[PDB]
Every structure is written in C-alpha cells, then in structure tokens.
C-alpha cells in the first residue's frame, strides 16, 4: 500500500543519516577553511605513490560506510550472498561518487579533502588531469541541483539496487526491490515539490561510464 512506501522512505533516510560518514553541517561551516598556497605545494610535491595510497585509503573508508548503508537497506539483507556482492562491487563506487557532491563547493570550485577545502590543483601529483576534472565537473553539475540529504538517500539507494547489473541470479527479486524504491523516490519528490530534479539527474550510463574509467586507472596502481 501507500503507508508501506512512506515507511520505506523514512527507513531509507534514517539509514543514510546514520551512515553519511560526514555530517552536512560540518562540511558547510568549514567551507571557509581553505588550504594555504603553501599547503597545496606540500600536496603537489608528494609522489604519485603517496598520493595514490592516500586517496585509496579515503575511498576504502568511504566504501565501508556505503556497505553499512546497504546493510540497513530494506530488502538487501534478504538477497543471496551472490547478488549482494554483485550489486555492491558494481555500485558501491558509484554511490561514493554521488555522495562526494556534498563535499563540493561550487562557489570557489573546491572540495573537502583531509580537513580543509582545496581546488583540483591539489591532486597534481596523481598525474591524471582528465580523471580529476571528471570528478569536479560531475560534482559541479550535481551541486547546482542542491540535493537534500533525503534526495541523496533515496537516489543512492536506487543507484545501488539495480536489476540491470550482469550476473544476477535472483533478478526477479531485485526488480521488486528497485520498484518499491523508485516509487518511494517519486512519492517523496511529490511530497516535497521537488519533481523537477528528475530531468536534471545524470543520465543512466554516465555514472557507470565514470566509475569504469576511475577503476581502470586505479587498478594500474
Ligand atoms: O576523498 S577522496 O580521496 C577525493 C579525491 C578527489 C577529490 C576529492 C576527494 N576520495 C573521495 C571519497 F569519497 F572516496 F572519500 C576519492 C579517492 C579516490 C578516487 C579515485 O576516483 C579512485 F579511482 F582512486 F577511486 C581517483 F583516485 F581516481 F581520483 C575518488 C575519490
């Protein structure tokens, strides 16, 4: 019914609030805390290897919270061990990317990274301009939509629970789950007068195309 769906919305948003890693109020009030021209040089002078192993640490950490988010998600636990791993190893990464836009400031084109805010010149040492630019451009486009926490909660759930991932065994059951989440998302945008964000959402395939490029560069190192 309908009450079930309102419950599902509430259920999903609680799970995100508990597992958002960084509170929005902390990220917003620290927007004035910017790296000095000296501190950026410090990061710029580091080696690829140090810089890669730092970023890979923050990512793994972020993925832990995404995993904890998936576990609190209604229906996910009921799935088999195979489909759980299929959905996670495909989408955990994609969720992390979506989550990142909260840490992005469009006013000065900076991102929160290890305590302070800094532009993309901070990652010079990684040696991959195009990849970093992708991340910033993607976050910038998502930041203009002013995603609420609940919108992020519901959207990331749908990113993660997708019945189009190859190698699913219990496909029919993942469809059912996705379904209810789609409805929950649409219901809530209606309740909040935010139906507008749908047409402004990233096209399906974009998220996946980004991740696939990021994972390939990463596996090198
Ligand atoms: O905090 S991060 O290191 C970060 C990287 C770049 C810009 C801002 C923040 N981290 C973001 C996270 F949400 F995971 F904390 C992050 C680390 C590494 C990446 C990479 O995409 C990849 F491929 F290594 F996973 C890349 F290193 F390529 F940038 C992406 C994001």
UniProtKB/Swiss-Prot annotation:
Q: In which tissues is it expressed?
A: Isoform 1 is widely expressed in many tissues, including liver and adipose, and highly expressed in skeletal muscle. Isoform 2 is primarily expressed in immature thymocytes.
Q: What induces it?
A: Up-regulated in the state of obesity.
Q: What is the effect of changing residue 62 to F?
A: Completely abolishes transcriptional activity
Tell where it localizes.
Nucleus
Q: Which residues form the NR LBD domain?
A: 4-221
Task: Quote the record's domain comment.
Answer: The AF-2 (activation function-2) motif is required for recruiting coregulators containing LXXLL motifs such as NCOA1 and NCOA2.
Subunit organization:
Interacts (via AF-2 motif) with the coactivator NCOA2 (via LXXLL motif). Interacts with the corepressor NCOR1. Interacts with CRY1. Interacts (via AF-2 motif) with the coactivators NCOA1 and PPARGC1A (via LXXLL motif). Interacts (via AF-2 motif) with PROX1. Interacts with FOXP3. Interacts with NR0B2.
The UniProt similarity line reads:
Belongs to the nuclear hormone receptor family. NR1 subfamily.
Q: What does this protein do?
A: Nuclear receptor that binds DNA as a monomer to ROR response elements (RORE) containing a single core motif half-site 5'-AGGTCA-3' preceded by a short A-T-rich sequence. Key regulator of cellular differentiation, immunity, peripheral circadian rhythm as well as lipid, steroid, xenobiotics and glucose metabolism. Considered to have intrinsic transcriptional activity, have some natural ligands like oxysterols that act as agonists (25-hydroxycholesterol) or inverse agonists (7-oxygenated sterols), enhancing or repressing the transcriptional activity, respectively.
Q: Which disease is it linked to?
A: Immunodeficiency 42: An autosomal recessive primary immunodeficiency characterized by increased susceptibility to concomitant candidiasis and mycobacteriosis. Candidiasis is characterized by persistent and/or recurrent infections of the skin, nails and mucous membranes caused by organisms of the genus Candida. Mycobacteriosis is characterized by infections caused by moderately virulent mycobacterial species, such as Bacillus Calmette-Guerin (BCG) vaccine, environmental non-tuberculous mycobacteria, and by the more virulent Mycobacterium tuberculosis.
Which protein is depicted?
Nuclear receptor ROR-gamma
Q: Which residues of the full protein are shown?
A: 266 to 486 of 518
């Amino acid at each position: 019914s309908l009450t079930e769906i309102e419950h599902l919305v509430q259920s999903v948003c609680k799970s995100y609030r508990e597992t958002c890693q960084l509170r929005l109020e902390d990220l917003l009030r620290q927007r004035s805390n910017i790296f000095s021209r000296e501190e950026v040089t410090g990061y710029q002078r580091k080696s690829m290897w140090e810089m890669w192993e730092r970023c890979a640490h923050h990512l793994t950490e972020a993925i832990q919270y995404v995993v904890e988010f998936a576990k609190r998600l209604s229906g996910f636990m009921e799935l088999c061990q195979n489909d759980q791993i299929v959905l996670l190893k495909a989408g955990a990464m994609e969720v992390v990317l979506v989550r990142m836009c909260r840490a992005y400031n469009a006013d000065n084109r900076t991102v929160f990274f290890e305590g302070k805010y800094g532009g993309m010149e901070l990652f010079r040492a990684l040696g991959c301009s195009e990849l970093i630019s992708s991340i910033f451009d993607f976050s910038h486009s998502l930041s203009a939509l002013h995603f609420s926490e609940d919108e992020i909660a519901l959207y990331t759930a749908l990113v993660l629970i997708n019945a189009h991932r190859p190698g699913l065994q219990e496909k029919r059951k993942v469809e059912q789950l996705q379904y209810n989440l789609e409805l929950a998302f649409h219901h809530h945008l209606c309740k909040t007068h935010r139906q507008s964000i749908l047409a402004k959402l990233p096209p399906k395939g974009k998220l996946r195309s980004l991740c696939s490029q990021h994972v390939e560069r990463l596996q090198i190192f």
